[PDB]
Amino acid sequence: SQPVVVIDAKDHLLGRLASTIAKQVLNGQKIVVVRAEALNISGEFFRNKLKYHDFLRKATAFNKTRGPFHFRAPSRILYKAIRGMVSHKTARGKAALERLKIFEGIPPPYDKKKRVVVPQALRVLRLKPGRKYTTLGKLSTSVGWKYEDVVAKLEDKRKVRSAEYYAKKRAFTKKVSSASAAASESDVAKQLASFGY
Amino acid sequence: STDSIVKASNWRLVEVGRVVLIKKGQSAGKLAAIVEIIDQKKVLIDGPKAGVPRQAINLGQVVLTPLTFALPRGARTATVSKKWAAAAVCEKWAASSWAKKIAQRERRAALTDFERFQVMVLRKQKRYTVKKALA
């Protein structure tokens, strides 16, 4: 219900996140995918790298600047898998694809704003333990993405700075959890435990 | 040799007499006891007091609670109603916060409108009496 939904994408399946985003962004929910380099995808590495070197081959053989534009970033791979699932040739598809932004890592527009997680698309809920997954960052670097070191440095420099925010918040939280847990014994709270809250 | 730190997980094992809870179906949300297993996926449940009959149900409908009480294999409804009351399971269950939270969650959707507004009045006093004291 929040108008800009920040879907975290650590260990989501690619197709199962693409479908539940392409249905949600067709109805107006401005969805921004964040950390789309940690996306996972079914099957092993040497099957999906083959299914991408079976896709780089397809190009217009009278002028190569016309046919399938093989975007090789792990943002734009999910973007291709969403462009397949909406009808981007129409105008409803264009005004629905404008409602979606896809990032690798976390840019500081979306630093301190809440990440939500799609439950029906998670790897830990949708694979069998024992099958082989594939990290999309591990795939795109093999197929020609030059931007792993920049995103890894720019992301863990964010994580080490975020941990001290969490250390401040965990100190602030037990102030309230010490004030109220020494003040919940009163009749103001016993008049509410008869009301459920 | 000095002590070894070996730990993986502390499961709630489906065993004989495991107090299990129906989560889906017509009689969902009332306690039951696993009498004996049948296959990998379906067990035989029998809960006398809570109202459920003696059935053979999937493990998909059921939810294993951590509290267990003893019984022999293949127990009938009479013997499990004896062991149930003698082990006092329906009293031991409500002491867990899971039952406390499930009763609170039952109560909140059972509130009427004036009982919601008195909550709205009473939630203007707790923080008003607490949040001045932290300075």
Added chain:
Amino acid sequence: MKYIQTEQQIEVPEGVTVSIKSRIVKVVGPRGTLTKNLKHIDVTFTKVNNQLIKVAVHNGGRKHVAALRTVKSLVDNMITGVTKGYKYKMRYVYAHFPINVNIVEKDGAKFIEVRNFLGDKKIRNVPVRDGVTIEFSTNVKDEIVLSGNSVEDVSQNAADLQQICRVRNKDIRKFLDGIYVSHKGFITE
């Protein structure tokens, strides 16, 4: 089919601990500190004794028992590499050209280097791994020794010395040379 449980157990000798959590197994024993990650096989360890430790897989479907037995024997070998170690004794064979193997202290590793192998003039380079202790034999002048803690290093280094001494486009059943592992003994026996 689906199983319910099969189990193996690891039997620790005197002096060694096993500190395991989240499928990283560990040994701090009388000689070494072997940390070995196991982060892709969904095994479950549980301590029954200070002398032996249960390691059991549940149902799985018989593609898991082949994992449970090898993950038992992996920790068995990882323990016995610290209790008694491994010691591979390799030996030169040469028909006419006397082989020269020595070490060098390069700016990378301690690069063990072999030359004069069937009269070749390219001086070959082999790196050493970390725990692999390399030494010579001063009773027979044709024998070298690898030792250490982890089997996937102390045998892999003998593999790296026995891979590159490969005869190219001549008969292997006529020109039989190279260095060969003979005695896979232990470091205390």
Added chain:
Amino acid sequence: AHFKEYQVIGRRLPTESVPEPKLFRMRIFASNEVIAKSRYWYFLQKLHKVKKASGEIVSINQINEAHPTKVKNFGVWVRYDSRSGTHNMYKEIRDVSRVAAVETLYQDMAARHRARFRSIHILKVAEIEKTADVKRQYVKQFLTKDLKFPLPHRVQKSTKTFSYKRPSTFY
């Protein structure tokens, strides 16, 4: 499939010469009383000289269970037509009733041998009375003394499509 184990009695029509032909009995597994009779007249037609218009279905009776709250070690015998050559088989079920064992007979028979319901004859469904004669490993691994096992990876069912926190799967 909600099966219902039926008991059917059939007889030839009474001839003026012999007005007492023998009543034949079958106890079959069928979904209702119509395919009950139509699977009766297909089984009896393989054995004796009678068609549907030459005999009368004397009696239909459902056979409710003798104890429907008891785990029984069923040993079912069966024959089935493959895509090349018909075969005899003997499976092992461990369900609670004869009505609910033949369903999971048909399900895993159609799963492991791809035989549909039109190719299978259920021969004999016998509750094995003890633990000695049963020799199927997928039951001898279930009947063990004081068996415990855990369910290691319990996934969560979901109701909404935006979980605000990372899921826990621990059971």
Added chain:
RNA sequence: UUUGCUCCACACAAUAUAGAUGGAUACGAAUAAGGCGUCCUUGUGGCGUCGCUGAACCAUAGCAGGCUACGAAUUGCAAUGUCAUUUUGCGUGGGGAUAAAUCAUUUGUAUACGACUUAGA
């Protein structure tokens, strides 16, 4: 010749809606494993509790919410009940800034023409 032109103001009027009417409420990582709290011989620690739905958490008392410290009936049995927000013009008062490019002409490191490249108070 502050006729010009832009920056702040609310002053008016007008303009486009991919569709705001309580709150996008921030650790990270593993899921056959974790979070939070206590204690210590600060650990892959001894101990306790917890998840089994965010159905949560915060705010919501007053002319869509006023004076002081009563006020809103008779928008008549429903008739959006407008308050959104990126733009722009015109007028008022308050500061600020004092240029470039193109053609023509020339050059040959360029050239079909356009273009590129230089030179000229």
Added chain:
RNA sequence: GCAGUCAAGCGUUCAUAGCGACAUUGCUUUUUGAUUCUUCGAUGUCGGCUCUUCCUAUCAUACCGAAGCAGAAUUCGGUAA
């Protein structure tokens, strides 16, 4: 066209280091034979010069394996356009 399946016998008594019959089975459109579906109010017809891209059933180059493989050249195949 031979890519696969059974391979008498031969290569000095030495069945698949290889080859060669009896003969079974299924590819290929690149031949020709077949029918006559598309223009008989015309799709310009062979061959060469020129020029680009593609296929693999590899002639050479790369890396291997196995060869009654001393070397050397051969010969037998595998990945590979």
Added chain:
RNA sequence: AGAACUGGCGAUGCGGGAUGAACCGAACGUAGAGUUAAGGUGCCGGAAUACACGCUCAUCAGACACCACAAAAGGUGUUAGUUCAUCUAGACAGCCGGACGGUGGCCAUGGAAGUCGGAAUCCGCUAAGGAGUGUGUAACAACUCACCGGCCGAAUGAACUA
């Protein structure tokens, strides 16, 4: 290329088979509602990221009959099953001990006790060990081992089917 019977297409739109003259459903005045047919319900795309039992992980998987192709033959890759079966009087294994003396039983002889080889075959000790299964010395040696025995107390070898 030529007949037989029915239905169709020609003359015929509509919902389904991605589009397709013949297939599937159905035949049509204009309108509103409900219900379905055939077909489907991740998303494009109206509709269960519904339930239940199984099997597969393919370095060219597989997904709606007509249909837009797939064989003969092979793979302990997995799964279920059939029928003999050695064998708790310790099977096969896995580590370990013996393989003995009667007797070099006879021919090829330049040199062959079992062994470049050939016509060929009885007994003691027993717990068991073949004039003998190969390596070998020009020959005698020395191993191997089906045959038993020490340990094991677990069973399992074998062909075949879908």
Added chain:
RNA sequence: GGCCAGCAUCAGUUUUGGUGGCAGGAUAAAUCCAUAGGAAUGUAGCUUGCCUCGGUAAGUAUUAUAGCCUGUG
């Protein structure tokens, strides 16, 4: 004095809920109660190596300081 909306009582075609009455069935089967019989995936007591009071074991015994099934009412 019309048109356009709202609500109520009707009528037709529906579509979606909660509850009751009656019958049929092995006059449902079950569970429940009573008796007999039996067995092990053996519940107490009893020989049995210290430990922790039968715990270790596997014999003994078939309802005892748990219970199970079969046959009947």
